[PDB]
Symmetry: C6
Subunit: 68 residues, 6 copies
Amino acid sequence: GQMLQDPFLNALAKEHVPVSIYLVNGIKLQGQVESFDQYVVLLRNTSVTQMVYKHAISTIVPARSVNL
Amino acid sequence: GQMLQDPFLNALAKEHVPVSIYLVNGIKLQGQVESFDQYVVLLRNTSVTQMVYKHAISTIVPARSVN
Amino acid sequence: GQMLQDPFLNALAKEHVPVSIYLVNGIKLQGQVESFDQYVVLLRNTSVTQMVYKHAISTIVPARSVNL
Amino acid sequence: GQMLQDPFLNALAKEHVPVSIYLVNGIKLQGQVESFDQYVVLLRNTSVTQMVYKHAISTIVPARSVNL
Amino acid sequence: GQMLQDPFLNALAKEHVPVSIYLVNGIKLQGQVESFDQYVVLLRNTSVTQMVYKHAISTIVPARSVN
Amino acid sequence: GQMLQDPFLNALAKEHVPVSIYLVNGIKLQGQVESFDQYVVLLRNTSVTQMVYKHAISTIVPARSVNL
């Protein structure tokens, strides 16, 4: 395929779908995708927006499927 | 060889072969390859389609071999 | 989106917001972002400025959210 | 040197030499190299051909040395 | 910023500042930065100069801050 | 600096200096550098020549310093 990553992240950011972001160090982050660019995802929880490097993301698991 | 990755992923997706995706953190994901692009594989389980970064994939083990 | 990484790091560096930098090896660094470039972040604690490779950063968690 | 990787993998694939492929997660795969490209190695065991990402390979140890 | 990595490594090498180099596998290396290029740092201990791949470096912690 | 990696590996390969190659998975390989290219190092022990991906190498520690 071509260009599935961005439609997927765009859907998460616009629809505010709850996600679980699994990092290569075993940490699981939870919140909503605020925004993203070439290298990072901005993830907002109850307290803070944190900057997650895509290079450290293994998988992003939405609470429900997004349609692209 | 040249361009074996995409034929492999395409065969999995079009023939709906169940796979095991082993990640660099030891997690094993299971389901169907829905689609893929330069950097990600969309993997569907019982519940949802999740986005897996290729950079975190160690190996993809199909339930049966593809053509 | 496009070019969210640098506005985020710029805000941290100019406003000196305390951060927690989680590395791929599970180490958690704490201090303030002094400066950054394509590949590294300079993080200052009470004692020293250390040079952190972005490739080893999983997430950067500010003590409070920055506006970009 | 220049372009030793491909002659090495070509010898394994054409001569079907048994290999042990050590991954960055400590997993050890065993079988024969079926084929390879820029990013992946196709490794066949008794049951199945699996697709191994080179980025996850630490070392490939043949059962005997190949000449290139 | 732009091009802070090399000034940092150059200061360590020219001022002979002892460093701790933490690797992604948890190993901590100690000694002097001898030299560096696009991909590696040459680190000298008691005995030898070893070649460290930047891709395996998490952080470099100097014994004292550089200018 | 510029182009220190190859002079270092060339010295190891031509002078056959015993090395210890530490991998990101904690494995320590021992032997001599046979050859190398952009992406791999061919390391020979008593039994076999194995192909090591540079991306999985943390550090290469020679038994004695090489002069470049």
